[PDB]
Design a protein around this ligand. Structure first.
Ligand SMILES: *[C@@H]1O[C@H](CO)[C@@H](O[C@@H]2O[C@H](CO)[C@@H](O[C@@H]3O[C@H](CO)[C@@H](O)[C@H](O[C@H]4O[C@H](CO)[C@@H](O)[C@H](O)[C@@H]4O)[C@@H]3O)[C@H](O)[C@H]2NC(C)=O)[C@H](O)[C@H]1NC(C)=O
Ligand SMILES: *[C@@H]1O[C@H](CO)[C@@H](O[C@@H]2O[C@H](CO)[C@@H](O[C@@H]3O[C@H](CO[C@H]4O[C@H](CO)[C@@H](O)[C@H](O)[C@@H]4O)[C@@H](O)[C@H](O)[C@@H]3O)[C@H](O)[C@H]2NC(C)=O)[C@H](O)[C@H]1NC(C)=O
Ligand SMILES: *[C@@H]1O[C@H](CO)[C@@H](O[C@@H]2O[C@H](CO)[C@@H](O)[C@H](O)[C@H]2NC(C)=O)[C@H](O)[C@H]1NC(C)=O
Ligand SMILES: *[C@@H]1O[C@H](CO)[C@@H](O)[C@H](O)[C@H]1NC(C)=O
Ligand SMILES: [Ca+2]
Ligand SMILES: [Ca+2]
Ligand SMILES: [Ca+2]
Ligand SMILES: [Ca+2]
Ligand SMILES: [Ca+2]
Lengths: 555, 557
């Protein structure tokens, strides 16, 4: 399930051949981690240390910036709090999502006093404003963490900010929060490992269930510690009802819809001891024709220090729902095994949204007390969620690096459509991989996008611009989703490359458009399609005249 | 985790007289079942349809007993469905000394296990190797029917302890005693609390006191975890029986009452506080100290995963092990309960404790009260696991594509002092020679002992002959424990080699006996010797110059 990359471009190869556009970043900043892509304006907003940037999608070297650090007073408290002056004692932006048609909402580590603000961007004729509207500063507790090292799932829909993070200086009170207008702040329970057990949040997504948008749910993806003998990590998926408002007598201003299930990403072994990849890292939804069933792509890595491994698992939303409808997890006590619950599941079912249609019940505060006391105590489901085909799409263990981030384009090619994964790496590398069905992953290329290795922290994709954007504390990098010239001048090579983007021009290898032209994504032999030492790898060499084959062609 | 200093391919070895090879009889295989007998300097080996008697000086000199099954039996086995070449024969699986003139031998009987005695002389030496015949004893519970299943076996006071499958179907695992003056005794049956589909590895009589009624038999093995819920898992285990355990009065008639088992843990602490485990036990090798009641258990372990191949060597203290077998028993009130350290009243005498004549009076296991028999009927497992000396492996091997299979350890008396030299076999037909320098493992050499890769199944060591003997289905191989010439002609190199066996002669690098100049710690030639693609591999090259630390540089050209 490993591969050898077909092509391998070092940073220098890249920059000389104009693949990368680099932002080395401001010398008084770092942590260019918090991405927000806005196609409407063609801009890539980025939250960093003491700044937010507004990058032009056409070329990130063209940008504006907002300077938004904390006061001297605050720098000083944070210092004497003990914290590291360069890495902790500043305003590290951690949250940056759209708000109304003219504003973003932004939150940052406030040198361990989290804070928020709005940022003016235009509406659609006039919209390259980047004004930092000032002296509101809202409180960032439960929105951004105090610690920059902690990450934070966040999602902002209907002017309300959902966010999973630590609520406290000490960095231990984790929770999913809703804040901002029109309703009392709601969160998960507190000091209750059944709900969340020292978790690390990764992303959150509003996924519609029906055509009625009161049925709408918010899905959080994260990882946490198992409750048992042996310390362990469980990857998790989490469910809230958009329109959940808290309970009447119990669970006042706390979720009642909260349910969570384990994500399993494991490779079946011969002994029937599977190999698990429990450390969730990025998640990326791929939108299908149905907005109620995106295809969840998830990046996972081994828990072990000794063995470095990485994995990519796909997950079906109807698979996930089955799990959230099946048996709840249960014990009669602390000294009991966890067990599928077969008592009476109170009605309406915990997990189900309030509706105006079925049940009658118009709110979460109209709920009976017995559905509230269940789910107070059965937040976890019993069944785990398994990937499509109970296997990873892809495994990477032979090698010394780990996967960090992912995005996926849906390239419309000659044979058909193909899902092209771009995977970031804790060594500053991107893998471009094609899922060609029968699946076969074909590792097209492995590119180095930073002068020096750093972990890639963020990756976003612009189909309009055909570009890929990358984050790290070192800076931001820009990539074309394809440069088809890079393969051969000859036909043979452009066909062999197996690149959904790249078809044979006639004259020389270039972008493929619908409706002359001759690529082969399956199989990829130049013979039946092109009608005419060290190469780039995956070809074996023979001296007789050097040769290269694995179709064949001399050198 | 290391790079081997030297690496000898099979050819290098055979050309330089390191290996003596037995490619084995063409109508045989599975040269797996070793019995070393220093007294009459011979290495007995149980194979497919034969037992061999190899001369320890040179295994090319040998005798053999031909002991296959009848036509009748070949024929049943065939029609039982079994593979004619790999299953339908007498694969010897057990071969231990019996009295001063006899061995006891047992084999897969083409899925009808059988045993026999083998005459060897009184001491003399008279080299008898007579197969005493037509008395064939029943091999059930002694050898398995399946050749692929392994079997711990130990024979002391004319009684054969053995852990294996008792049945054709290969599922009824148990520790057995047979050949008694006493009724046959075994573990319980169909009870995963006791043994849960285990794979036995070796068994050892380890004295507790000076009174040899306190003697215990320790089995080393692995098995499946019991959960309660799913994650399938392997636990490495150590197991305890009382030599003189005879069964219970009313209950556990002719079954062990002394049986207790504990988990062996061999794990590397991780930064997140998720340790990395090596649960698959493979070989075990006791190293005898001045105290025969505390040998140092060396154990070879590998990962359970298919995807990630890893291997590990963990040492274990016998006083560590005993603490565990005296501590809390494992317990549940039911199937849906967590396992829990037992804090009820532990009936007396303690389950696990041997019958003695000294204290209490109680002269047997059948004199035991019924309440100590009903406990231990149900608490055969201990709660605490056993951790290695320093909660770490001695050595880890994960970067590489092979796994460890077998081990032995010599205690080389060197100039600086004593050093424990591990020889480790490999599922690729390779031996690693490793030195534990005090902590630091130094991978002296990595040798290939079979023309083609096969798993090493057996490894035995002869200090008298200074030789190492290896097993596989392909055959048997012989190694000198040292060939000191192999390093440099110069002093520098022989010192650098860090080999307990090898000191600098004066004239040229040779064996060390109690003018010499070795350095095992550190190993720098400067303070000890007062005189391109390098030969070494832990040396770096600045072009061709050569420099390794332990820094020590010298101009290679
Ligand atoms: C597997 O392969 C080998 C063949 O490569 C085979 O070994 C042969 O076995 C037989 C008996 O097992 C040996 O017979 C012996 O031959 C010597 C000559 O040096 C004789 O002294 C003896 O022959 C007599 O054996 C009995 C003596 O008590 C008499 O009853 C009988 O009349 C025999 O004539 C002695 O036994 C033969 O030498 C070996 N040797 C070799 C080098 O092959 C082995 O049996 C095969 N195993 C099987 C089929 O299980
Ligand atoms: C981190 O480093 C940066 C230096 O690399 C700092 O950037 C400076 O930030 C200050 C205030 O935050 C700006 O002050 C402004 O002055 C401009 C003057 O016009 C300038 O316009 C462009 C911007 O498009 C600028 O690049 C030119 O130098 C022009 O002179 C006024 O528009 C405003 O009134 C405002 O006060 C500096 O322009 C800006 N300079 C540079 C070179 O970046 C940043 O403040 C540092 N942050 C810290 C220490 O927290
Ligand atoms: C060692 O054991 C073997 C087998 O038990 C003994 O061999 C037999 O001894 C019996 C009496 O016990 C006699 O009838 C025969 O002389 C032997 N026959 C066979 C087929 O083995 C042997 O005597 C014992 N040797 C000792 C104690 O030195
Ligand atoms: C967007 O929100 C801000 C207040 O946070 C406000 O000043 C601005 O007018 C808003 N725009 C709307 C509601 O269109
Ligand atoms: Ca977002
Ligand atoms: Ca991402
Ligand atoms: Ca053979
Ligand atoms: Ca033995
Ligand atoms: Ca062994």
């Amino acid at each position: 399930k490993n591969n050898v990359p077909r092509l391998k471009l070092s940073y220098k190869e890249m920059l000389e051949s104009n693949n990368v556009i680099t932002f080395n970043g401001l010398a008084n900043s770092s942590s260019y981690h918090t991405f927000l892509l806005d196609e409407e304006r063609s801009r890539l907003y980025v939250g960093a240390k003491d700044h937010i940037f507004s990058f032009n999608l056409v070329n990130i070297k063209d940008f504006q910036k907002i300077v938004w650090p904390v006061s001297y007073t605050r720098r000083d408290e944070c210092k004497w709090a003990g914290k590291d002056i360069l890495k902790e004692c500043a305003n590290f932006i951690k949250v940056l999502e759209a708000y109304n048609q003219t504003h973003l909402y932004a939150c940052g580590t406030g040198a361990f006093h989290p804070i928020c603000t709005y940022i003016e961007v235009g509406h659609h004729p006039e919209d390259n404003i980047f004004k930092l509207q000032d002296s509101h500063f809202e409180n960032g507790r439960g929105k951004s963490p105090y610690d920059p090292k902690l990450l934070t799932a966040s999602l902002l829909i209907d002017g309300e900010l959902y966010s999973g993070t630590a609520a406290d200086f000490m960095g231990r009170d984790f929770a999913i929060f809703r804040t901002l207008g029109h309703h009392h702040p709601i969160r998960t329970e507190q000091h209750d490992s059944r709900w969340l057990n020292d978790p690390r949040f990764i992303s959150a997504h509003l996924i519609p269930e029906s055509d009625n948008p009161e049925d709408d749910k918010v899905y959080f993806f994260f990882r946490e510690n198992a409750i048992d003998s042996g310390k362990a990590t469980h990857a998790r998926i989490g469910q809230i009802c958009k329109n959940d408002f808290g309970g009447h007598r119990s669970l006042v201003n706390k979720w009642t819809t909260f349910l969570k299930a384990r994500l399993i990403c494991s490779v079946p072994g011969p002994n029937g001891i599977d190999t698990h990849f429990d450390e969730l890292q990025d998640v990326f939804l791929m939108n299908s024709k149905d907005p109620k069933n995106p295809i969840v792509y998830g990046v996972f890595t081994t828990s072990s220090n000794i063995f470095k491994g990485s994995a990519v698992c796909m997950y079906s939303m109807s698979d996930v729902r089955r799990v959230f409808l099946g048996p709840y997890a249960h014990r009669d006590g602390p000294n009991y095994q966890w067990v599928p619950y077969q008592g009476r599941v109170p009605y309406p079912r915990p997990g189900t949204c309030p509706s105006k249609t079925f049940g009658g019940f118009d709110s979460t505060k109209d709920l009976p007390d017995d559905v509230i006391t269940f789910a107070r105590s059965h937040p976890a489901m019993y069944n785990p969620v398994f990937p499509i085909n109970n296997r990873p799409i892809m495994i990477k263990t032979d090698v010394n690096y780990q996967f960090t981030q992912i995005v996926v384009d849906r390239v419309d090619a000659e044979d058909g459509q193909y899902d092209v994964m771009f995977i970031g790496t804790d060594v500053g590398t991107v893998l471009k991989v094609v899922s060609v069905p029968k699946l076969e992953e074909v590792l097209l290329e492995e590119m180095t996008v930073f002068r020096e290795p750093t972990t890639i922290s963020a990756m976003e994709l612009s189909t309009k611009q055909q570009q890929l954007y990358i984050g790290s504390t070192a800076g931001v990098a820009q990539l074309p989703l394809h440069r088809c010239d890079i393969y051969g001048k000859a036909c043979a090579e452009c066909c062999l490359a197996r690149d959904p983007y790249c078809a044979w021009d006639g004259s020389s290898c270039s972008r493929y458009f619908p409706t002359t032209r001759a690529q082969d994504i399956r199989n990829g032999d130049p013979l039946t399609h092109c009608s005419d030492x060290x190469x780039x790898x995956x070809x074996x060499x023979x001296x007789x005249x050097x040769x290269x084959x694995x179709x064949x062609x001399x050198x």
